[PDB]
Amino acid sequence: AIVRAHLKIYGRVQGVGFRWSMQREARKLGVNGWVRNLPDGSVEAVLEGDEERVEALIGWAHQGPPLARVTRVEVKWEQPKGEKGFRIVG
Amino acid sequence: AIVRAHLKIYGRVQGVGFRWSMQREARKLGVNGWVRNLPDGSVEAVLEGDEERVEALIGWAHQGPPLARVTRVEVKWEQPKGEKGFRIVG
Ligand SMILES: [Cl-]
Ligand SMILES: [Cl-]
Ligand SMILES: [K+]
Ligand SMILES: [K+]
């Protein structure tokens, strides 16, 4: 089924390539959406596509790139909005 | 590469078949470890195996079975211990 996951990711997650690496992984998986930094130090993302591929990216987001140290992820499931491509937006 | 993720999972996560569904998904994916209910209403799990399989299960854990509502997952990455099979402990 097609799903849309809205994430907030916490930890040592800025300045370590999280957004670029997420985008690379989304494009490999065929997941559309976006990622951005928030001013509290967290990362916000929208992941939209086939449930298996979205879940794969959610799981990836608990590890992140080598220097990320994620402590927690929050997911809110949403109705698909027809995201096209995976973009870094902030 | 082999990884080990230690999770605490919060929300409406007990009394919804979460442990049974996680066990099913773990066995499907070939992830080793365990899951248990905690007295504060949260779920604790250890997931160990190939990183792609573990990541798929972590992603699944934010959806859960149909009635599950997962509000957050806390994660700690650990040194693998040699878990074999997945079981429910508590
Ligand atoms: Cl970044
Ligand atoms: Cl259960
Ligand atoms: K990492
Ligand atoms: K659910």
PDB file of C-alpha atoms and ligand atoms in Angstrom:
ATOM      1  CA  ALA A   1       0.000   0.000   0.000  1.00  0.00           C
ATOM      2  CA  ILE A   2       1.083   3.646  -0.406  1.00  0.00           C
ATOM      3  CA  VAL A   3       1.845   5.516   2.802  1.00  0.00           C
ATOM      4  CA  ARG A   4       3.169   8.866   4.003  1.00  0.00           C
ATOM      5  CA  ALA A   5       5.313   9.115   7.122  1.00  0.00           C
ATOM      6  CA  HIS A   6       6.090  12.457   8.786  1.00  0.00           C
ATOM      7  CA  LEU A   7       9.198  12.153  10.980  1.00  0.00           C
ATOM      8  CA  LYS A   8      11.016  14.128  13.614  1.00  0.00           C
ATOM      9  CA  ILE A   9      14.489  12.763  14.310  1.00  0.00           C
ATOM     10  CA  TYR A  10      16.503  13.709  17.440  1.00  0.00           C
ATOM     11  CA  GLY A  11      20.105  13.396  18.562  1.00  0.00           C
ATOM     12  CA  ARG A  12      23.420  14.428  17.004  1.00  0.00           C
ATOM     13  CA  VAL A  13      21.832  14.819  13.590  1.00  0.00           C
ATOM     14  CA  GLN A  14      22.874  18.199  12.173  1.00  0.00           C
ATOM     15  CA  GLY A  15      26.237  19.008  10.555  1.00  0.00           C
ATOM     16  CA  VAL A  16      26.935  15.344   9.795  1.00  0.00           C
ATOM     17  CA  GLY A  17      25.406  14.908   6.329  1.00  0.00           C
ATOM     18  CA  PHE A  18      22.015  13.578   7.480  1.00  0.00           C
ATOM     19  CA  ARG A  19      19.985  15.484   4.887  1.00  0.00           C
ATOM     20  CA  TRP A  20      22.197  14.619   1.924  1.00  0.00           C
ATOM     21  CA  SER A  21      22.518  10.969   2.924  1.00  0.00           C
ATOM     22  CA  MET A  22      18.744  10.678   3.478  1.00  0.00           C
ATOM     23  CA  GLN A  23      18.159  12.111   0.033  1.00  0.00           C
ATOM     24  CA  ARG A  24      20.607   9.589  -1.529  1.00  0.00           C
ATOM     25  CA  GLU A  25      18.877   6.720   0.267  1.00  0.00           C
ATOM     26  CA  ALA A  26      15.391   7.981  -0.704  1.00  0.00           C
ATOM     27  CA  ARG A  27      16.407   8.183  -4.349  1.00  0.00           C
ATOM     28  CA  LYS A  28      17.833   4.623  -4.229  1.00  0.00           C
ATOM     29  CA  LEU A  29      14.579   3.360  -2.645  1.00  0.00           C
ATOM     30  CA  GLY A  30      12.197   5.431  -4.832  1.00  0.00           C
ATOM     31  CA  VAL A  31      10.786   7.303  -1.846  1.00  0.00           C
ATOM     32  CA  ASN A  32       9.536  10.864  -2.480  1.00  0.00           C
ATOM     33  CA  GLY A  33       9.273  13.737  -0.031  1.00  0.00           C
ATOM     34  CA  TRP A  34      11.616  16.082   1.781  1.00  0.00           C
ATOM     35  CA  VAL A  35      13.977  16.736   4.647  1.00  0.00           C
ATOM     36  CA  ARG A  36      15.008  19.829   6.614  1.00  0.00           C
ATOM     37  CA  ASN A  37      16.767  21.006   9.735  1.00  0.00           C
ATOM     38  CA  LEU A  38      14.763  22.508  12.555  1.00  0.00           C
ATOM     39  CA  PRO A  39      16.119  25.248  14.827  1.00  0.00           C
ATOM     40  CA  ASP A  40      15.960  23.027  17.936  1.00  0.00           C
ATOM     41  CA  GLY A  41      18.659  20.709  16.510  1.00  0.00           C
ATOM     42  CA  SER A  42      16.241  18.093  15.143  1.00  0.00           C
ATOM     43  CA  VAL A  43      15.591  16.899  11.608  1.00  0.00           C
ATOM     44  CA  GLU A  44      12.100  16.851  10.053  1.00  0.00           C
ATOM     45  CA  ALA A  45      11.191  14.702   7.040  1.00  0.00           C
ATOM     46  CA  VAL A  46       8.295  13.505   4.889  1.00  0.00           C
ATOM     47  CA  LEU A  47       8.624  10.053   3.304  1.00  0.00           C
ATOM     48  CA  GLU A  48       6.007   8.928   0.772  1.00  0.00           C
ATOM     49  CA  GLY A  49       5.671   5.789  -1.308  1.00  0.00           C
ATOM     50  CA  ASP A  50       5.267   2.053  -1.108  1.00  0.00           C
ATOM     51  CA  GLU A  51       5.062   0.911   2.539  1.00  0.00           C
ATOM     52  CA  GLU A  52       8.069  -1.415   2.367  1.00  0.00           C
ATOM     53  CA  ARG A  53      10.346   1.258   0.864  1.00  0.00           C
ATOM     54  CA  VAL A  54       9.140   3.929   3.307  1.00  0.00           C
ATOM     55  CA  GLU A  55       9.723   1.603   6.247  1.00  0.00           C
ATOM     56  CA  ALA A  56      13.218   0.831   4.951  1.00  0.00           C
ATOM     57  CA  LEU A  57      13.987   4.579   4.970  1.00  0.00           C
ATOM     58  CA  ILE A  58      12.444   5.101   8.408  1.00  0.00           C
ATOM     59  CA  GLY A  59      14.694   2.341   9.755  1.00  0.00           C
ATOM     60  CA  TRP A  60      17.731   3.852   8.011  1.00  0.00           C
ATOM     61  CA  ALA A  61      16.870   7.145   9.725  1.00  0.00           C
ATOM     62  CA  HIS A  62      17.476   5.553  13.132  1.00  0.00           C
ATOM     63  CA  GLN A  63      21.138   4.999  12.114  1.00  0.00           C
ATOM     64  CA  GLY A  64      21.808   7.905   9.761  1.00  0.00           C
ATOM     65  CA  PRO A  65      25.191   8.562   8.176  1.00  0.00           C
ATOM     66  CA  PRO A  66      28.344   7.449  10.054  1.00  0.00           C
ATOM     67  CA  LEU A  67      28.670  10.456  12.335  1.00  0.00           C
ATOM     68  CA  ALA A  68      24.981  10.830  13.205  1.00  0.00           C
ATOM     69  CA  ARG A  69      23.961   9.596  16.640  1.00  0.00           C
ATOM     70  CA  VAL A  70      20.164   9.324  16.665  1.00  0.00           C
ATOM     71  CA  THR A  71      18.409   8.980  20.036  1.00  0.00           C
ATOM     72  CA  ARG A  72      14.746   8.963  19.021  1.00  0.00           C
ATOM     73  CA  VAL A  73      12.347   9.113  16.089  1.00  0.00           C
ATOM     74  CA  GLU A  74       8.698  10.185  16.078  1.00  0.00           C
ATOM     75  CA  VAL A  75       6.436   9.188  13.191  1.00  0.00           C
ATOM     76  CA  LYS A  76       2.998  10.579  12.327  1.00  0.00           C
ATOM     77  CA  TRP A  77       1.253   8.719   9.489  1.00  0.00           C
ATOM     78  CA  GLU A  78      -0.516  10.973   6.974  1.00  0.00           C
ATOM     79  CA  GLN A  79      -2.557  10.813   3.753  1.00  0.00           C
ATOM     80  CA  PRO A  80      -0.325  10.877   0.631  1.00  0.00           C
ATOM     81  CA  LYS A  81      -0.041  14.298  -0.987  1.00  0.00           C
ATOM     82  CA  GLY A  82       1.619  13.250  -4.261  1.00  0.00           C
ATOM     83  CA  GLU A  83       5.214  14.114  -3.428  1.00  0.00           C
ATOM     84  CA  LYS A  84       7.539  14.124  -6.425  1.00  0.00           C
ATOM     85  CA  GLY A  85      11.260  13.727  -5.933  1.00  0.00           C
ATOM     86  CA  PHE A  86      13.091  13.919  -2.635  1.00  0.00           C
ATOM     87  CA  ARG A  87      14.241  17.427  -1.755  1.00  0.00           C
ATOM     88  CA  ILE A  88      16.303  19.173   0.861  1.00  0.00           C
ATOM     89  CA  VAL A  89      14.131  22.133   1.862  1.00  0.00           C
ATOM     90  CA  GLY A  90      15.740  23.698   4.940  1.00  0.00           C
TER      91      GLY A  90
ATOM     92  CA  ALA B   1      27.147  -5.474   8.384  1.00  0.00           C
ATOM     93  CA  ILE B   2      25.725  -6.946  11.584  1.00  0.00           C
ATOM     94  CA  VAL B   3      24.121  -4.448  13.952  1.00  0.00           C
ATOM     95  CA  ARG B   4      22.181  -4.508  17.217  1.00  0.00           C
ATOM     96  CA  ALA B   5      19.449  -1.983  17.984  1.00  0.00           C
ATOM     97  CA  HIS B   6      17.912  -1.653  21.401  1.00  0.00           C
ATOM     98  CA  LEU B   7      14.453  -0.012  21.256  1.00  0.00           C
ATOM     99  CA  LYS B   8      11.912   1.425  23.621  1.00  0.00           C
ATOM    100  CA  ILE B   9       8.570   1.883  21.875  1.00  0.00           C
ATOM    101  CA  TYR B  10       5.776   4.117  23.193  1.00  0.00           C
ATOM    102  CA  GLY B  11       2.127   4.808  22.431  1.00  0.00           C
ATOM    103  CA  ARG B  12      -0.821   2.477  22.187  1.00  0.00           C
ATOM    104  CA  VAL B  13       1.528  -0.475  22.003  1.00  0.00           C
ATOM    105  CA  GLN B  14       0.140  -3.065  24.431  1.00  0.00           C
ATOM    106  CA  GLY B  15      -3.096  -4.983  24.053  1.00  0.00           C
ATOM    107  CA  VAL B  16      -2.934  -4.629  20.256  1.00  0.00           C
ATOM    108  CA  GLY B  17      -0.951  -7.753  19.219  1.00  0.00           C
ATOM    109  CA  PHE B  18       2.316  -5.818  18.906  1.00  0.00           C
ATOM    110  CA  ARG B  19       4.655  -8.492  20.270  1.00  0.00           C
ATOM    111  CA  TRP B  20       3.052 -11.198  18.177  1.00  0.00           C
ATOM    112  CA  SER B  21       3.164  -9.076  15.013  1.00  0.00           C
ATOM    113  CA  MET B  22       6.783  -8.028  15.660  1.00  0.00           C
ATOM    114  CA  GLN B  23       7.792 -11.634  16.157  1.00  0.00           C
ATOM    115  CA  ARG B  24       6.076 -12.537  12.894  1.00  0.00           C
ATOM    116  CA  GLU B  25       7.855  -9.738  11.028  1.00  0.00           C
ATOM    117  CA  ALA B  26      11.219 -10.540  12.619  1.00  0.00           C
ATOM    118  CA  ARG B  27      10.947 -14.205  11.600  1.00  0.00           C
ATOM    119  CA  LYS B  28       9.943 -13.130   8.070  1.00  0.00           C
ATOM    120  CA  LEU B  29      12.967 -10.794   7.831  1.00  0.00           C
ATOM    121  CA  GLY B  30      15.496 -13.009   9.645  1.00  0.00           C
ATOM    122  CA  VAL B  31      16.095 -10.645  12.540  1.00  0.00           C
ATOM    123  CA  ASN B  32      17.170 -12.103  15.858  1.00  0.00           C
ATOM    124  CA  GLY B  33      16.458 -10.898  19.363  1.00  0.00           C
ATOM    125  CA  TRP B  34      13.461 -10.363  21.569  1.00  0.00           C
ATOM    126  CA  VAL B  35      10.531  -8.199  22.585  1.00  0.00           C
ATOM    127  CA  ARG B  36       8.687  -7.620  25.861  1.00  0.00           C
ATOM    128  CA  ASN B  37       6.073  -5.513  27.524  1.00  0.00           C
ATOM    129  CA  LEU B  38       7.173  -3.203  30.310  1.00  0.00           C
ATOM    130  CA  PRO B  39       5.012  -2.252  33.303  1.00  0.00           C
ATOM    131  CA  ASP B  40       4.945   1.436  32.281  1.00  0.00           C
ATOM    132  CA  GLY B  41       2.990   0.495  29.117  1.00  0.00           C
ATOM    133  CA  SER B  42       5.965   0.668  26.727  1.00  0.00           C
ATOM    134  CA  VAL B  43       7.546  -2.122  24.667  1.00  0.00           C
ATOM    135  CA  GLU B  44      11.250  -3.007  24.794  1.00  0.00           C
ATOM    136  CA  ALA B  45      13.049  -4.870  22.031  1.00  0.00           C
ATOM    137  CA  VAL B  46      16.448  -6.038  20.911  1.00  0.00           C
ATOM    138  CA  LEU B  47      16.970  -6.426  17.156  1.00  0.00           C
ATOM    139  CA  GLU B  48      20.132  -8.003  15.841  1.00  0.00           C
ATOM    140  CA  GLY B  49      21.199  -9.053  12.379  1.00  0.00           C
ATOM    141  CA  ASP B  50      22.072  -7.693   8.966  1.00  0.00           C
ATOM    142  CA  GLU B  51      21.647  -3.913   8.963  1.00  0.00           C
ATOM    143  CA  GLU B  52      19.087  -3.890   6.101  1.00  0.00           C
ATOM    144  CA  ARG B  53      16.895  -6.452   7.855  1.00  0.00           C
ATOM    145  CA  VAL B  54      17.140  -4.699  11.215  1.00  0.00           C
ATOM    146  CA  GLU B  55      16.324  -1.371   9.560  1.00  0.00           C
ATOM    147  CA  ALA B  56      13.263  -2.878   7.864  1.00  0.00           C
ATOM    148  CA  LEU B  57      11.996  -4.108  11.215  1.00  0.00           C
ATOM    149  CA  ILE B  58      12.604  -0.779  12.936  1.00  0.00           C
ATOM    150  CA  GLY B  59      10.609   0.930  10.140  1.00  0.00           C
ATOM    151  CA  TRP B  60       7.826  -1.599  10.575  1.00  0.00           C
ATOM    152  CA  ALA B  61       7.797  -0.918  14.325  1.00  0.00           C
ATOM    153  CA  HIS B  62       6.555   2.636  13.742  1.00  0.00           C
ATOM    154  CA  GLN B  63       3.473   1.272  11.940  1.00  0.00           C
ATOM    155  CA  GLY B  64       2.860  -1.827  14.034  1.00  0.00           C
ATOM    156  CA  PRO B  65      -0.247  -3.934  13.704  1.00  0.00           C
ATOM    157  CA  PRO B  66      -3.457  -2.148  12.692  1.00  0.00           C
ATOM    158  CA  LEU B  67      -4.501  -0.896  16.117  1.00  0.00           C
ATOM    159  CA  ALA B  68      -1.037   0.093  17.320  1.00  0.00           C
ATOM    160  CA  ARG B  69      -0.345   3.818  17.564  1.00  0.00           C
ATOM    161  CA  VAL B  70       3.396   4.383  17.998  1.00  0.00           C
ATOM    162  CA  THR B  71       4.245   7.890  19.257  1.00  0.00           C
ATOM    163  CA  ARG B  72       8.000   7.461  19.502  1.00  0.00           C
ATOM    164  CA  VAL B  73      10.847   5.006  19.338  1.00  0.00           C
ATOM    165  CA  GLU B  74      13.979   5.513  21.436  1.00  0.00           C
ATOM    166  CA  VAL B  75      17.013   3.752  19.943  1.00  0.00           C
ATOM    167  CA  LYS B  76      20.502   2.783  21.227  1.00  0.00           C
ATOM    168  CA  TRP B  77      22.945   1.009  18.922  1.00  0.00           C
ATOM    169  CA  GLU B  78      24.963  -1.705  20.671  1.00  0.00           C
ATOM    170  CA  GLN B  79      27.707  -4.234  20.080  1.00  0.00           C
ATOM    171  CA  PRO B  80      26.163  -7.471  18.697  1.00  0.00           C
ATOM    172  CA  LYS B  81      26.029 -10.335  21.197  1.00  0.00           C
ATOM    173  CA  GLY B  82      25.111 -13.316  18.968  1.00  0.00           C
ATOM    174  CA  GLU B  83      21.324 -13.481  19.331  1.00  0.00           C
ATOM    175  CA  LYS B  84      19.699 -16.411  17.498  1.00  0.00           C
ATOM    176  CA  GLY B  85      16.012 -16.542  16.685  1.00  0.00           C
ATOM    177  CA  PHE B  86      13.402 -13.997  17.815  1.00  0.00           C
ATOM    178  CA  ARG B  87      11.234 -14.576  20.882  1.00  0.00           C
ATOM    179  CA  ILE B  88       8.783 -12.912  23.201  1.00  0.00           C
ATOM    180  CA  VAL B  89      10.079 -12.640  26.745  1.00  0.00           C
ATOM    181  CA  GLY B  90       7.609 -10.434  28.574  1.00  0.00           C
TER     182      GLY B  90
HETATM  183 CL    CL C   1      23.106  17.706   6.399  1.00  0.00          CL
HETATM  184 CL    CL C   2       1.162  -8.876  21.833  1.00  0.00          CL
HETATM  185  K     K C   3      25.345   6.522  12.583  1.00  0.00           K
HETATM  186  K     K C   4      -0.930   0.858  13.137  1.00  0.00           K
END
